[PDB]
Design a protein around this ligand. Structure first.
Ligand SMILES: Cc1cc2ccnc(NC3CCNCC3)c2[nH]c1=O
Length: 130
């Protein structure tokens, strides 16, 4: 219906805004674009579902997220990919893991503050009805 289309449009607007605020944070530059195959060739073989904030924006615009829960699965994916691929004690690995956890925590915190629970509940109920 028109009302449901409006609901999903508001969701997309909300998610673009959250995603932009993560994307402009200097700490998260490493998560803004797909990993460069030239810089690292073995990433595609180790990480089976690469995810990044530009890909999240593309998915928002393709109507791939019908709930904030589904959006957060991809934010969690960016984080878990980073923890999996960079597990070592070296400072490069520890820096990226700290940033990955910070990205995750920041997204959840923005959502906890600015997502209305009844809005999310509506989204989930429309999704489940389809
Ligand atoms: C997303 C991403 C980017 C990246 C860039 C450069 N290096 C990485 N890993 C190194 C592995 C060896 N230790 C230093 C860090 C990257 N890892 C990523 O997950």
């Amino acid at each position: 219906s028109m009302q449901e289309e409006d609901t999903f449009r508001e969701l997309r607007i909300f998610l673009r805004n959250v995603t932009h605020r993560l994307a402009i944070d200097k700490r998260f530059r490493v998560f803004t674009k797909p990993v460069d195959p030239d810089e690292v060739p073995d990433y595609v073989t180790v990480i089976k579902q690469p995810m990044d904030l530009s890909s999240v924006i593309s998915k928002i615009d393709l109507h791939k997220y019908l709930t904030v829960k589904d959006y957060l699965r991809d934010i969690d994916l960016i984080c878990s990919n980073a923890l999996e691929y960079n597990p070592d004690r070296d400072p490069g690995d520890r820096l990226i893991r700290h940033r990955a956890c910070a990205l995750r925590d920041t997204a959840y915190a923005i959502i906890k503050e600015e997502l209305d629970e009844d809005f999310e509940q509506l989204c989930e109920e429309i999704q489940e009805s389809r």
